[PDB]
Design a protein around this nucleic acid. Structure first.
Ligand SMILES: C=C1[C@H](COP(=O)(O)OP(=O)(O)OP(=O)(O)O)[C@@H](O)C[C@@H]1n1cnc2c(=O)nc(N)[nH]c21
Ligand SMILES: OC[C@H]1O[C@@](CO)(O[C@H]2O[C@H](CO)[C@@H](O)[C@H](O)[C@H]2O)[C@@H](O)[C@@H]1O
Ligand SMILES: [Mg+2]
Lengths: 551, 407
DNA sequence: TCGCCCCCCTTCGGTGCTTTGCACCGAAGGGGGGC
C-alpha cells in the first residue's frame, strides 16, 4: 500500500471512456453490490457520483482455485486511450536455467494488483457504474483506488513496484536466488533448512510492511514445487501433464489447439513433429470447418502420442560444465534438438521447423536451427553451447567457400546420426569439356499470359515449347527445366536470367514452387552442370539465336 | 550546474521504441556494474514503465583495453533527433585528415558526462538491462547528461571541446583533429614513435581538464581488372563481354562489338577462339579506360554515403562507396590478417568497421551499408566482434554475383 | 466479453527493383504456456 504512485497519462487529445454496463439483472447487480462492498471497506474502490462522466463495464471469472472469483473490467476502450508503457517483462524463466539449490520455497502475493495504489489523478477514468435494478433507477458507481485487473498499465506498474520492494532484500542477500514472475516468487538458497526458513520469514515480513501478503495457501515448503507450469523436484523437473484432444471429427480450431500443445510439449519431449498437422491448417476458411486428417497427419499424431506416453524429465543447470546442443534432421524442413551437459540427461529439448523463404536448402536451415538454439541458450544460461551437428566438415567447408553470403557456425563437432545434412549437387566452376552447350531463353508477354521457353545447342539441337498462364521469370526457369530435361548427365547451360541464375546458384534442395522443385530434382540427377550468364539483347553467341527462336 | 540546451525531435516523430535483445552473462554483469556506478554519480536515473521509450544496450571490449565499454545503440534516436546544422552547432570536416601518415582514434565520450541534458529530452534515452533466464524484469535507466552515442552530444559539447583543444592545436599546427561522435581522429605526418608520444601528450591534456592507429596514406583503390591470357575460350569471351557491358554503366566509351562478333554462331563453351587484331585493339582500349578513375564523380555533402561489400573468398572483401549508383567515390579491397581465417561473420564485421572508419576520415561520416549476409546470421554474432563506439546504418541484401566484377 | 509476457504456424499487405511478379519482412490472425 504505502508504495509511491506511478504517474500515468491518457494519450494526447483523448478523453476517458464513456460506455455502458451489461446484462442487467437482480442476481447480477446484487452480486455486484456484494462484490464491491468489501473492496470499498478495504479502500480498494470508492463510490462516485454523476459529476464523473466516465464509465466502463465489469464482469467476473473463476480462479485456478475454482471457488474464488476474479473481478475483471472490460477496459478495452480505456486501454486504447491510455499512454503506452515499456514492458519490463522481457521473457519467461525456464526450469532448465535453474541451478540445484539446497533449500527451495515458492510464495505468491495475495490480491497482488489490489495492493498497489493507482495514480490519484487517473482514478476518475476507471469509473464503472453498476445499475440500479435492471435499469429502473439511477445506479451505483465506483472508481478504482488500486491497479485494476484488465487495465493495460496494471501489469507493468505492479512489476515495477514488486521490483522496488524486493530490491533491498536482494542486495542484502545476494546468495539467495529470487525468481520474480509477476507476484510469484521462487526463492532458492544453499543455507540449511532452518536458516533458509528464517530468511523466508524475514522476506515475508518485509513484503508485509509494504502491504504484500503471502497467504499460507500459496506458500510451498516441500517438493514437488508447482512453478510456472512445472514440477520442481530436487534432482529433476517435469512439465505438468499435457492432455491432447482425442476427437473423432476435427475442426480447424481443434487442430490449432493440438499443434499448440505439441509445441509446448516439445520443450522436454524429444522428437515432436507438427509439420503434417499444421499443413491441415493451410488454405482453410473457418475455425469451425471440419478438416479430415490426412494419412500423414494421423501418422505424425500417432508418433507424437507414442513419445508423450513415455515419462520424461529435465535436469538443472550446472555452471561448471559445458552446455552441449545436438541436432537431428527429421525431414521436410523439420529439426529437433536436445541440450545437455552429461549424456542422456537433457536440460531441455526443442524443435525448429520454420520455412524461411521460397527456396532454401538443408544447410541454410541447419544454420537457422543453430541460430535459434544460440539465442535461446543465451536467454536461459547466458552463454552459447557447443554443437553436435549431423553435417560433415567437408560439406560445411564446401558450402561456405562457394556461397556468396557470409555465413558461420560456432564451435561444433560432427556427429554421425543419419540422415546427414549435405549439399545435393554443386555447380561446376568451369565449363565441362565434351558436354553439350545449351543456350536457353524464355519470354512471356505481360498482357497476354502467354510465353515460350526453348533452347539452341552447339550440337544442332533446338526446341521451343509454348506456355500459358505464365510470367517472365517462370518462362526462364521453364527454359532451364527444358535443357536439363533434354541433356545428358553433363551439360553446359547459358541463360540471360539473373533471376533464375540467382536461385539455382544458391543450391536449393527444396522450394515452395513446383517448377523450381522439378529443376532441383533434375539437378540432383546430373553428374556435372555448368551454368553461365550473359546479358540479353547483345547479339551474343548462342544467346542471340535462341532469343531469335522464342520470338 | 550549467544551463541546459533545449532539444527537440524532428516534427511529427516520436522517441525510439526498440526492444532489448538477449545478452550473455558477462555483458550483463559488465552493464550492471557500469550502470550502478553511473547511477551513483548521477549520470543516469532509475525509471519505471510509464516511460514508453527504449533503446538497446550492449557492451564491447577493445582487444587492447580489456575493460568493458557500454554501448547504447542510439541509431534510432539520432535519426529522430533535430539537426544541428540549424542551430549552427554542427562540426566541419578537415580535408587534411586523410593525407596524414598516421591517424589515431581516441574515445573521448566520457567528456560528455559533465554537461547536463535538457530535462524534457531525457525520457527519450531510456534503456533496459536484461536478466539471465528472466529471473527479474528488465532494469530501466535514462540519462541526465549528454549520452555517449547520441548525435546531439558532440553538437552541444562542441564549444567546450574547442576550448580544451585550442592550446594543443595551437602548439601543434600540423596535427589534424576531427571529432566524430564520441571519437577524436588524430592525424600527423610524423614518424611512428613521436606520433604516439604526442598522442600521449594529447591524452594527459584531456585528462587534465577532465589508441588505434590508421595509415590513410596507404589506403588504395582497387579498379576493375580484365584477365590476361594468350588463348581464349568462348566462355572466357562471354565472361569478358558481360563484365565490360556492366562496366559501361560506370565508364565512358567502352565497346564490345569486336569481341562480341568473335562469338557469332552457337559454339561449345570450351571452343578456343583466336582474337582478331581488331578485338585485341578493342580490349586494350577498354583495359585502360578501366585503368584510370572516372571523370565527373564528386562528393556531395548533402547526400548520404552508401557502401556495398562482396565476399570474394580466402578472406578477401571488395567494396564500393557511392552516393549515386555507378558513380563510385571509392572502390577497395579489404583483407584480414588474423591468420585464423575461419569466420565469415567476424571478417565482415571488421570489414564494416574499417570501411566506416575510412569514410569518417575521408568525408566525416559513415555510409549506410548493404551487407551480403542474412539478417538473422548477422544479428546472431556481429556484436561479438564490434569495437567501435559508433554504429553505422545497414540493411541486408542477397545479390548473387553475376560477373566477378571487382576481383 | 479483461490485462501484460514468451513460443510456433499461417496469412496478409507494404516495399523496392535499371520489376510488371517476386522475394523479403513486419504485423496480426489462430494456438500453446505463465501470472
Ligand atoms: C498476475 C496477476 C496478479 C497475480 O496473479 P494471481 O493469480 O496470484 O492473482 P492474485 O494474486 O490477485 O490473487 P491471489 O490472492 O489468489 O493470489 C493478479 O493480481 C492480477 C494479474 N492477473 C492474473 N491473472 C489475470 C487475468 O486473467 N487478467 C488480468 N487482468 N490480470 C491477471
Ligand atoms: O539489424 C537491424 C535491426 O536492428 C535494429 C535494432 O534492434 O535496428 C537498428 O538497426 C537498423 C539498421 O541500420 C536501424 O535502422 C535502426 O535505427 C537501429 O535501431 C532493429 O530495429 C532492426 O530489426
Ligand atoms: Mg497472488
Amino acid at each position: 500500500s504505502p508504495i509511491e504512485t506511478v504517474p500515468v497519462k491518457l494519450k494526447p487529445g483523448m478523453d476517458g471512456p464513456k460506455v455502458k454496463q451489461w446484462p442487467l439483472t437482480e442476481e447480477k447487480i446484487k452480486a455486484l453490490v456484494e462484490i464491491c462492498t468489501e473492496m470499498e471497506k478495504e479502500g480498494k474502490i470508492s463510490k462516485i457520483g454523476p459529476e464523473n462522466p466516465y464509465n466502463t463495464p465489469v464482469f467476473a471469472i473463476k480462479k485456478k482455485d475454482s471457488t474464488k472469483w476474479r473481478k475483471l473490467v472490460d477496459f478495452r476502450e480505456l486501454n486504447k486511450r491510455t499512454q503506452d508503457f515499456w514492458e519490463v517483462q522481457l521473457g519467461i524463466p525456464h526450469p532448465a536455467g535453474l541451478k540445484q539449490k539446497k533449500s527451495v520455497t515458492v510464495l505468491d502475493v495475495g490480491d497482488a494488483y489490489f495492493s498497489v495504489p493507482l495514480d490519484k489523478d487517473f482514478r476518475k477514468y476507471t469509473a464503472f457504474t453498476i445499475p440500479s435494478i435492471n435499469n429502473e433507477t439511477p445506479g451505483i458507481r465506483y472508481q478504482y483506488n488500486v491497479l485494476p485487473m484488465g487495465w493495460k498499465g496494471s501489469p507493468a506498474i505492479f512489476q515495477s513496484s514488486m521490483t522496488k520492494i524486493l530490491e533491498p532484500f536482494r542486495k542484502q542477500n545476494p546468495d539467495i536466488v529470487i525468481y520474480q514472475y509477476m507476484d510469484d516468487l521462487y526463492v532458492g538458497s544453499d543455507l540449511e533448512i532452518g536458516q533458509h526458513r528464517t530468511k523466508i520469514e524475514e522476506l515475508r515480513q518485509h513484503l508485509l510492511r509494504w502491504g504484500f501478503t503471502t497467504p499460507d495457501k500459496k506458500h510451498q515448503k516441500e517438493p514437488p514445487f508447482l512453478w510456472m507450469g512445472y514440477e520442481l523436484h530436487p534432482d529433476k523437473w517435469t512439465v505438468q501433464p499435457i492432455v491432447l484432444p482425442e476427437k473423432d471429427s476435427w475442426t480447424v480450431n481443434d487442430i490449432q489447439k493440438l499443434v499448440g500443445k505439441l509445441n509446448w510439449a516439445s520443450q522436454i519431449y524429444a522428437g515432436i513433429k507438427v509439420r503434417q498437422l499444421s499443413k491441415l491448417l493451410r488454405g482453410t476458411k473457418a475455425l469451425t470447418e471440419v478438416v479430415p486428417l490426412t494419412e500423414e497427419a494421423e501418422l505424425e499424431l500417432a508418433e507424437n502420442r507414442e513419445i508423450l506416453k513415455e515419462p520424461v524429465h529435465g535436469v538443472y543447470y550446472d555452471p561448471s560444465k559445458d552446455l552441449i546442443a545436438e541436432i537431428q534432421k527429421q525431414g521436410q524442413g523439420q529439426w529437433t534438438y536436445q541440450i545437455y551437459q552429461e549424456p542422456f540427461k537433457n536440460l531441455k529439448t526443442g524443435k525448429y521447423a520454420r520455412m524461411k523463404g521460397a527456396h532454401t536448402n538443408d544447410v541454410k536451415q541447419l544454420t537457422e536451427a543453430v541460430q535459434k538454439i544460440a539465442t535461446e541458450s543465451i536467454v536461459i544460461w547466458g552463454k552459447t553451447p557447443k554443437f553436435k551437428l549431423p553435417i560433415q566438415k567437408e560439406t560445411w567447408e564446401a558450402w561456405w567457400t562457394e556461397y556468396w553470403q557470409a555465413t558461420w557456425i560456432p564451435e561444433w563437432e560432427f556427429v554421425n546420426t543419419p540422415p546427414l545434412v549435405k549439399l545435393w549437387y554443386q555447380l561446376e566452376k568451369e565449363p565441362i569439356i565434351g558436354a553439350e552447350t545449351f543456350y536457353v531463353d524464355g519470354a512471356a508477354n505481360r498482357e497476354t499470359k502467354l510465353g515460350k521457353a526453348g533452347y539452341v545447342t552447339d550440337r544442332g539441337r533446338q526446341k521451343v515449347v509454348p506456355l500459358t498462364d505464365t510470367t517472365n521469370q517462370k518462362t526462364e526457369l521453364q527454359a532451364i527445366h527444358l535443357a536439363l530435361q533434354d541433356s545428358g548427365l553433363e551439360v553446359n547451360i547459358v541463360t540471360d536470367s539473373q533471376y533464375a541464375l540467382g536461385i539455382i546458384q544458391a543450391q536449393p534442395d527444396k522450394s515452395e514452387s513446383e517448377l523450381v522443385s522439378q529443376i532441383i530434382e533434375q539437378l540432383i540427377k546430373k553428374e556435372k552442370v555448368y551454368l553461365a550468364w550473359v546479358p540479353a539483347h547483345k547479339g551474343i553467341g548462342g544467346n542471340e539465336q535462341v532469343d531469335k527462336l522464342v520470338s | 550546474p550549467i544551463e541546459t540546451v533545449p532539444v527537440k525531435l524532428k516534427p511529427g516523430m516520436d522517441g525510439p521504441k526498440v526492444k532489448q535483445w538477449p545478452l550473455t552473462e558477462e555483458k550483463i554483469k559488465a552493464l550492471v556494474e557500469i550502470c550502478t556506478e553511473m547511477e551513483k554519480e548521477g549520470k543516469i536515473s532509475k525509471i519505471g514503465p510509464e516511460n514508453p521509450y527504449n533503446t538497446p544496450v550492449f557492451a564491447i571490449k577493445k582487444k587492447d583495453s580489456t575493460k568493458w565499454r557500454k554501448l547504447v545503440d542510439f541509431r534510432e534516436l539520432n535519426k529522430r533527433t533535430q539537426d544541428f546544422w540549424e542551430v549552427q552547432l554542427g562540426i566541419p570536416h578537415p580535408a587534411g585528415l586523410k593525407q596524414k601518415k598516421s591517424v589515431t582514434v581516441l574515445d573521448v565520450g566520457d567528456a560528455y558526462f559533465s554537461v547536463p541534458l535538457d530535462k524534457d529530452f531525457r525520457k527519450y534515452t531510456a534503456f533496459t538491462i536484461p536478466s539471465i533466464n528472466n529471473e527479474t524484469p528488465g532494469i530501466r535507466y535514462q540519462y541526465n547528461v549528454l549520452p555517449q552515442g547520441w548525435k546531439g552530444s558532440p553538437a552541444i559539447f562542441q564549444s567546450s571541446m574547442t576550448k580544451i583543444l585550442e592550446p594543443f592545436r595551437k602548439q601543434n599546427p600540423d596535427i589534424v583533429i576531427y571529432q566524430y561522435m564520441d571519437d577524436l581522429y588524430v592525424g600527423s605526418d610524423l614518424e611512428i614513435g613521436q606520433h604516439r608520444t604526442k598522442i600521449e601528450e594529447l591524452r594527459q591534456h584531456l585528462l587534465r581538464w577532465g589508441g588505434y592507429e590508421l595509415h590513410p596514406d596507404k589506403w588504395t583503390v582497387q579498379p576493375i581488372v580484365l584477365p590476361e591470357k594468350d588463348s581464349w575460350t568462348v566462355n572466357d569471351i562471354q565472361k569478358l563481354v558481360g563484365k565490360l557491358n556492366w562496366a559501361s554503366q560506370i565508364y565512358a566509351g567502352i565497346k564490345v562489338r569486336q569481341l562480341s562478333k568473335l562469338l557469332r554462331g552457337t559454339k561449345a563453351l570450351t571452343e578456343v577462339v583466336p582474337l582478331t587484331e581488331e578485338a585485341e585493339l578493342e580490349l586494350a582500349e577498354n583495359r585502360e579506360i578501366l585503368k584510370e578513375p572516372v571523370h565527373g564523380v564528386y562528393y556531395d555533402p548533402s547526400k548520404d554515403l552508401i557502401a556495398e561489400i562482396q565476399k570474394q573468398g580466402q578472406g578477401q572483401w571488395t567494396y564500393q562507396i557511392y552516393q549515386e549508383p555507378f558513380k563510385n567515390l571509392k572502390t577497395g579491397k579489404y583483407a584480414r590478417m588474423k591468420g585464423a581465417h575461419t569466420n565469415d561473420v567476424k571478417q565482415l564485421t571488421e570489414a564494416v568497421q574499417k570501411i566506416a572508419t575510412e569514410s569518417i576520415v575521408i568525408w566525416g561520416k559513415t555510409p549506410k551499408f548493404k551487407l551480403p549476409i542474412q539478417k538473422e546470421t548477422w544479428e546472431a554474432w556481429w556484436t561479438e566482434y564490434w569495437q567501435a563506439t559508433w554504429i553505422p546504418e545497414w540493411e541486408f541484401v542477397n545479390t548473387p554475383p553475376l560477373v566477378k566484377l571487382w576481383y
